[PDB]
RNA sequence: CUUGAGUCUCGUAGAGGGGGGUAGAAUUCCAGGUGUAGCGGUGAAAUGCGUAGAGAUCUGGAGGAAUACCGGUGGCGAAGGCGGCCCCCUGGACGAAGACUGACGCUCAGGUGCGAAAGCGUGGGGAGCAAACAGGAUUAGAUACCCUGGUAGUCCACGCCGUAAACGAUGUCGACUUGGAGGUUGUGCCGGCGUGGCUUCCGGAGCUAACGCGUUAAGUCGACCGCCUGGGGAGUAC
C-alpha cells in the first residue's frame, strides 16, 4: 500500500511509503542467509571505482533460487519476506520433500499458493518452465539467458518480459527496456510479473533516506574546479562546453555499447 | 417480403443453418436490410446475431475479399 | 437476483405460510438477503453505478417497510431486526 | 448446471487426434456430473476465410449441461491446446437434443 | 464486387455488370461517406432531418393526389 | 524478356490522379503509368481522359511481356475507374475479370476533419 | 377494507451496467520481393515525399483505436449516456393467471449520490486524429478559413473537476377529457377480432400574444418542490 506521511516535520512532509502488511514481520529463514559486507564502491586496489557508494544499513544476503531447478516436486508458499538486497519481495517456499528455498515473489503470489517447475508444470504465475514449453505471448520474469545458468532478466520489482515469437532454437523476447532480444528456447522463465509493482511509487522524502540505502551525495561537475572535472571552473555560474563524464566522454546521447560478440542476439535495440 | 420465420414457427435462427443465412446476405457478404427481405424486426435482430456468430466460426465470410 | 429456491426458503422461514409472500417480514428478509448478497458484487465492481442504483432502491424500500412495521407492531419489528442483524 | 453449446475447430493436420479430444472432454464433463446432450463430429470443412494460413479445419459440436467451473476449465484447455484453432462457447436456454443442420 | 467475365460476353456488357455490382454494394457512397469525420451530433442531425423530410414529402404527395391542379 | 501472357491491372483511382500498375498474378509489377505522368497536370490530371491515356501508356509499357489476359482490380472513387478499363480493353487485352478492391474499414481509424471551404 | 403502493410464481424483449476474452475489415509503421519516375495536394499552387528507388503492387511482422453491413423519427437507461461476437457478475421494465401484505403513499428545503466534452494529478499506452506549434498558400494584412506536417489530448487504471443550447429550452406524482395513421414489445380468442407497455406523425375541443400544444397537453384539476419580477452594469465585485 502507498501511504503518504503527515507533515509533522519538514523531513516527513514529502515522504511516501510502501506498506505491505503481508510481509513476514519476524526474522528471515536462517539457513538461507549469509553475510555480505559493504564495499564503499572500492575494488581490490582499494580505489573508488563506483562513486557515491557508502554507509547505509547492515544487510544479510538471502540465497534466492534463480535457477528453479527442482523439477516435478511441488512447493507451497509459506510466507513473503522483505529482502534488503533487491527491490522485489521474496517468498519462502517449502517443497514436499522438506526442502525450503527463497524465490522472487511474483505478482499475486501469497501464502498457501502452490508452485512447480519443469517441462510439465502448469501455466500459472510462479511456475517455471523452459521457454519452449511456454505459450508465445506469455508474460514471464526471471528469464534465463543461457540454459541452466539461472534467471538474469526481469528480476526487479514490477518487471516482466513478453515472449513475442519462437523461431526454431530461439525465442524472441521484449525486454522491459524495449529491446527485442533472442535467447535459446531451452532457457527457463517463470510465469507472471515480478511483484511489488508499487515500489517505484515511494518517495524518499529526505536526504537521510538516501543515506540509509548506502547512497552518498553526488557533486555536480560544474560545482568543481577545472583540475577536478572538465565542467569545473568559472567566475560565477559558467558552463560553455558539451557535457561530459568526469573522464571526458560526452554524456548526453553518445552511445557506448561495443560488444560485437552479442550483437547477433539483439533483434532491435530499445530506442 | 414474406417473413419466413414466423410462418415456420422458429424459436431461434440457428447460426449453423448456413442455407437459410445465405438468403440474408448479399453476394459481397453484407447483411441484407429487412426493408428488402421483409423480415420482421425481431427476427432481423436474431438473424444479425446468427450471421455474426457464423462469421466468427468461418462458416460465412465477412466479405468477398478475404 | 435471488434464485427461486432461496426466495422460497426465506418465504417459508419468515412467512406465516408458504403462500404468505407479501407480509412485511418476508419482504424485509428478501431485501436483506439480496442486499447482503450484492455486497460481494459491489466489492468487486465498484464502478457499477447503474446496478448500485437498484441496490440503493432495495435499501430505501427496506427502510420504508421497517418504519411501517415499527409504527404498526413494535414487537414484530424488534424480532425481525434481531433475526436479520439490522441496526434499526 | 447450465446448458452450453460448444464448437471447436482443430488443425486439419491433427484430425486423428479429434476422437481422443472428444472422449477426454466428455470425460471431464461427465466426471463433473454433467451430461452430453448432443455431439456431432462434422469432420473437415473448408473455412470461409483463411485462419493462420489454413484453409480447412475439423469442426466438433457439443451440447453439454455442466456447472460453470468445468466449462471454464474446458475453455482454458482450448486456450492452451495449439491443435484447437478456434472455439465458441454459447449459453443455451435448454438442452438441445437434436440433429444440427450440418448432419 | 468480384465479377468474372463469362464466355462469348462482349466487354461492354461485362463492364456494365461490374458497374451495377459496385453501385449495388455502395462502394462509392461508402468511400465518400468516409472521407472526413462527421461528429455524432452532425450524423444524428442528418438522419433526423432526412427522416422528417421523407415523411413530410410522403404526406404532401398523399394529400396532393386529392388535389386537382386545374 | 520473360513472357507472362496473364496479368493483373491495378487501377488506383483517387480524386486527384490515376495510377495504373500491371503485374503478374503473383503481384510483381511489370510496368506502370499515371495520369499525372502522361502530360496532364492540375485540373486535367484528374479526368477520365487522362486516365485513359495512362491506361494506354501502361499497356504500351508491358508490350515486351506478351500479356494477353488481364484481371482488373479497381480501387478508389476517382474519375478514372471506368475509362481505364475501357482503354485496357481497346488496347487488345482480354479482360477476364473485374474486381473492386476499394478498402472499407469495418467501424477503423478516425478520418481527417471536414474541410471548411 | 383493498381500489393506491408493494411481495411471490411463470415468461418476454432490450447498444441498461461492471469485469474478462476474442474476431474480421482498415490505417500506420517495420522487413523484404517486383518495378521506375514520379507521388501527394489545391480553386490554382507550393511547402512536403521520391533515383539514397518513392508512389503503385505482393509477402511477412508489430501495434493502437474503432466495430461497415444489420441500423430503423428501432431499442435500453433517472439523467449523463449505451452499438462486432462470446462468457462471468448484475440493475431495471413489461405481460398473463392467480396468491399474499394491507395505505406500507406522493412530493421534498437542507443533505447525499450520479453526472457529456474539455481540463487536472499519478502511472501506463499512443495506430489514426489533432488544440498548440512550424512551414506553404491566400490576402492590403491573414496571428484564420485551404495545404503539408505536428505535440498535448483523444485510449487504459485510479483519483479530482461538477460544468454544457446537461434541450422537449416544457419539475415530479395522480385523475379526467372527441379522433386518425404508423413503429416496437407482450398477451387472449378464432390471416380476422380483442387487450396491455413503450413510442413517431397528424389533428378536434380547449388553451395560447402568436407560433403552436393537443390523452406522451402547453386542455381540465389536485399534492409538493424549484424558479422569475425592465435593459445594461453582472452571474460581475467583495
Ligand atoms: Mg552516482
Ligand atoms: Mg542527484
Ligand atoms: Mg568553487
Ligand atoms: Mg580539464
Ligand atoms: Mg556570469
Ligand atoms: Mg556565455
Ligand atoms: Mg485532405
Ligand atoms: Mg437540493
Ligand atoms: Mg475526457
Ligand atoms: Mg491525463
Ligand atoms: Mg500520436
Ligand atoms: Mg491542419
Ligand atoms: Mg447551468
Ligand atoms: Mg444531450
Ligand atoms: Mg435531444
Ligand atoms: Mg434549463
Ligand atoms: Mg398536433
Ligand atoms: Mg463567478
Short mmCIF file of N, CA and C in Angstrom, two decimals, chain A residues 73-79 92-96 110-115:
data_model
loop_
_atom_site.label_atom_id
_atom_site.label_comp_id
_atom_site.label_asym_id
_atom_site.label_seq_id
_atom_site.Cartn_x
_atom_site.Cartn_y
_atom_site.Cartn_z
N UNK A 73 8.65 -31.52 -8.22
CA UNK A 73 8.34 -31.57 -6.80
C UNK A 73 7.55 -30.31 -6.46
N UNK A 74 6.30 -30.43 -6.03
CA UNK A 74 5.53 -29.22 -5.72
C UNK A 74 6.06 -28.53 -4.47
N UNK A 75 5.85 -27.22 -4.42
CA UNK A 75 6.21 -26.41 -3.27
C UNK A 75 5.06 -25.47 -2.94
N UNK A 76 4.93 -25.13 -1.67
CA UNK A 76 3.87 -24.26 -1.19
C UNK A 76 4.50 -23.02 -0.57
N UNK A 77 3.96 -21.85 -0.91
CA UNK A 77 4.48 -20.59 -0.39
C UNK A 77 4.16 -20.51 1.10
N UNK A 78 5.19 -20.50 1.93
CA UNK A 78 4.98 -20.32 3.36
C UNK A 78 4.71 -18.85 3.69
N UNK A 79 5.55 -17.94 3.19
CA UNK A 79 5.37 -16.53 3.50
C UNK A 79 6.18 -15.67 2.54
N UNK A 92 9.41 -17.44 0.81
CA UNK A 92 9.97 -18.66 1.37
C UNK A 92 9.03 -19.80 1.00
N UNK A 93 9.50 -20.72 0.17
CA UNK A 93 8.68 -21.82 -0.32
C UNK A 93 9.17 -23.12 0.32
N UNK A 94 8.23 -24.03 0.54
CA UNK A 94 8.50 -25.32 1.17
C UNK A 94 8.15 -26.43 0.19
N UNK A 95 9.14 -27.21 -0.21
CA UNK A 95 8.91 -28.32 -1.12
C UNK A 95 8.38 -29.53 -0.36
N UNK A 96 7.70 -30.41 -1.09
CA UNK A 96 7.08 -31.57 -0.47
C UNK A 96 8.10 -32.52 0.13
N UNK A 110 0.94 -15.49 -2.80
CA UNK A 110 0.70 -15.29 -1.38
C UNK A 110 0.84 -16.63 -0.67
N UNK A 111 0.76 -16.58 0.65
CA UNK A 111 0.93 -17.77 1.46
C UNK A 111 -0.13 -18.80 1.11
N UNK A 112 0.30 -20.05 0.96
CA UNK A 112 -0.58 -21.13 0.58
C UNK A 112 -0.59 -21.46 -0.90
N UNK A 113 -0.13 -20.55 -1.75
CA UNK A 113 -0.07 -20.82 -3.19
C UNK A 113 0.88 -21.97 -3.48
N UNK A 114 0.56 -22.75 -4.51
CA UNK A 114 1.39 -23.87 -4.94
C UNK A 114 2.14 -23.49 -6.20
N UNK A 115 3.39 -23.93 -6.30
CA UNK A 115 4.22 -23.67 -7.47
C UNK A 115 4.98 -24.93 -7.83
#
